Design a protein around this nucleic acid. Structure first.
Ligand SMILES: Nc1ncnc2c1ncn2[C@@H]1O[C@H](COP(=O)(O)O[C@@H]2[C@H](O)[C@@H](COP(=O)(O)OP(=O)(O)OP(=O)(O)O)O[C@H]2n2cnc3c(=O)[nH]cnc32)[C@@H](O)[C@H]1O
Ligand SMILES: Nc1ncnc2c1ncn2[C@@H]1O[C@H](COP(=O)(O)OP(=O)(O)OP(=O)(O)O)[C@@H](O)[C@H]1O
Ligand SMILES: [Mg+2]
Ligand SMILES: [Mg+2]
Ligand SMILES: [Zn+2]
Ligand SMILES: [Zn+2]
Lengths: 343, 346
DNA sequence: ATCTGTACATGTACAGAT
DNA sequence: ATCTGTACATGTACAGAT
DNA sequence: ATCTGTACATGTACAGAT
DNA sequence: ATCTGTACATGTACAGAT
């Protein structure tokens, strides 16, 4: 049943092969351009992020997320109000972008990508119209199949993480205190998402990647000499329910996969043992994930896993009407064996 | 009962504090002297190894082990007669130690030793001499009188960043215990060659750095022994075994062939045999220690104790230790085992 | 003026002491 | 139970060198 | 600085065994 | 139906060469 949905959602080895080679062709060429041209983004290094690289992509290999991280010689951050996740960057190449303005830096970035994309004759690839706010430059590829690639510009800072994350990332009873201390020794990132035009947002896409691939309390969880768990299959099922519901109801435009990602990070923290995620219990795991997500909706409360004061379900960001709509549609599919999965 | 031996074995913070103060002064001075003039060992880097940095040093903080490791490219190893553990290494500053292509180990260790002895001669804050050279030892031992006697093994080590030698391919069998990602990463760490002998140009593989990692990341659960996880008795068992051997080794010179590396190796195998943290519950410390003794006894009797990292190397082979010596320790361990461990009260 | 090997500065797991 | 010294990892400053 | 080579993780695909 | 074993595929860390 739920197994059979997971069979349907599984990407195909050939589809992975074909899509990956076209995306890699494009992304390498853009990344060359930022380097072997004396631009403000020389030094930018590639970091792959998102569900395709976390092995939780469903249905088709048709969406890829790539960070072009750029190391910045220190530091000065100022928190935008007390939102937790938005910051003004203050303090050379980047002199053309002044306070370091996200909009002006993104526009140059965007302008380089668009130029280099006009110079692609090998692949059918366009630049999607800019979505205000959003930190991404989105490529639309078409080797028959439609594939979209998000090129995310990011700042890399090696200093300690901002104070708003001090109580974040609570993996101590799950992944433990050494894993946490080491993760927090990694750099943190800032992306040019706005709010207004000078604000950057914290990104922890590199930390979420590690956690998805290091998700057990036992070191052998999901390894060739360990037990398989069903944590990723539960994420996929929950991502699938929201994709089907969003595709049908335009009332759900304000929800996104990151809401599902954040909720299941919390669930994993509350149920740390690998046995609470035994494959033979895929049903009650998916069901307890649903119950948790409904508790989040009912209480209009879903805190950023790394930034606890930042409520992703705050009234300011999603209306109570949108949440009660989602809770009714979800409770429905739940109590009727998920008809939506058969579409 | 066994909880009380461990209390006796526990180090005292005051002793730790005074001992580490002097040791760090001396070591830092030797390391800085290695970085000066036209010194061949310039670039050498420091790596603290051994039981003190693993937190399984027992009774007193009176024996420290430090590698002075030196990176070298080129590599070109040649295994010494299928033994698994011993190798030949084939304006370069190490030029003075070549014997045509081949890096002589005793030549390097002499020049290393001459430098340490000179630096100890100029030390006047601390009472420290250099111990007479021991055959079959890559160390330059310092004896410090801190009033208290404290020895320091300065181990000279070559560092190589290439893949580990073929003889370790089937070694380090942690896949069911610490798992395969940890194994892959560990084997991406460099490996080390110390000048232990066999003749003056043979080096021995060293994995002190890997053993130090394993000692401090020893559980199947990532939270083993952490402040939000369960305590285990894996290190408490190793301590008790170190102590049984130490007590016995200082009464019976029938046991000079045996060393604490033997008990360290047997227990890496026990930790592989019994991966789960539940097989090392603190409340089953008697039975845990007991199975470890059973295991060590079988190794003595079958004379077989494979190097944890180099499987074809048998530390209990007949060419290394007599049947005589192994049977003598089998009786003495069996005796302690079945009479309440009277040696613990000495 | 800039560069850099060295050593300070920061943070925290570990485990002994209270 | 909390307090606390040592070890160790990684970031950063700077006297002396270029 | 840039790039290739190497190893093995995480996947998919499928047949023979259970 | 599920487990095991082998082939097949891409992603990623980093040593060594240039
Ligand atoms: N912080 C970020 N780090 C890296 N990439 C980011 C980040 N924030 C945004 N992006 C990328 O920009 C596009 C638009 O961003 P929005 O913030 O406007 O909306 C996000 C998006 O609509 C959705 C999920 O996107 P994603 O592709 O990352 O999903 P996935 O995990 O790879 O799985 P699937 O593709 O299979 O669904 O969630 C929104 N969102 C809100 N906050 C965050 C966040 O903190 N991190 C990531 N996404 C967030 C996006 O397409 C995104 O790629
Ligand atoms: N025979 C050996 N073969 C391989 N490695 C060895 C051998 N003897 C010692 N070593 C390595 O050198 C380290 C130091 O050895 P040493 O004899 O000081 O033991 P230890 O583990 O430090 O314990 P203790 O000092 O309490 O006896 C060991 O931890 C091990 O990594
Ligand atoms: Mg995505
Ligand atoms: Mg020692
Ligand atoms: Zn798992
Ligand atoms: Zn433990």
């Amino acid at each position: 049943k739920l197994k059979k949905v997971l069979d349907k959602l599984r990407l195909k080895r050939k589809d992975i092969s074909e899509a990956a080679e076209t995306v890699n062709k494009v992304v390498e060429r853009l990344l060359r351009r930022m380097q072997k041209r004396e631009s403000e983004f020389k030094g930018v290094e590639q970091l792959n992020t998102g569900s395709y690289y976390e092995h939780v992509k469903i249905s088709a290999p048709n969406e890829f997320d790539v960070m072009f991280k750029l190391e910045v010689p220190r530091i000065e951050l100022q928190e935008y109000y007390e939102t937790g996740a938005f910051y003004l960057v203050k303090f050379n190449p980047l002199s053309h972008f002044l306070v370091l303005s996200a909009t002006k830096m993104l526009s140059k970035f965007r302008k380089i990508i668009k130029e280099e994309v006009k110079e692609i004759k090998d692949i059918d690839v366009s630049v999607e119209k800019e979505k205000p706010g959003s930190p991404a430059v989105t490529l639309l590829i078409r080797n028959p199949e439609e594939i979209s690639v998000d090129i995310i510009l990011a700042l890399e800072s090696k200093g300690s993480w901002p104070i708003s994350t001090k109580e974040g990332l609570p993996i101590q009873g799950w992944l433990g205190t050494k894993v946490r201390t080491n993760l927090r020794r990694e750099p943190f990132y800032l992306v040019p998402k706005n709010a207004q035009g000078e604000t950057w947002r914290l990104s922890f896409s590199h930390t979420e990647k590690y956690i998805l691939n290091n998700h057990g309390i036992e070191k052998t969880c999901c390894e060739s000499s360990g037990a398989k768990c069903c944590r990723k299959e539960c994420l996929k099922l929950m991502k699938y329910l929201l994709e089907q519901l969003k595709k049908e109801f335009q009332e759900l435009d304000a929800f996104c996969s990151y809401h599902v990602k954040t909720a299941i990070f919390h669930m994993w923290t509350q149920d740390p043992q690998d046995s609470q995620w035994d494959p033979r219990n895929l049903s009650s795991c998916f069901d307890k994930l649903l119950a948790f997500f409904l508790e989040c909706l009912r209480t209009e409360k879903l805190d950023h896993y790394f930034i606890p004061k930042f409520n992703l379900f705050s009234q300011e960001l999603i209306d109570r009407k949108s949440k009660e709509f989602l809770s009714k549609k979800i409770e429905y599919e739940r109590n009727n064996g998920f008809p939506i999965f058969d579409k």
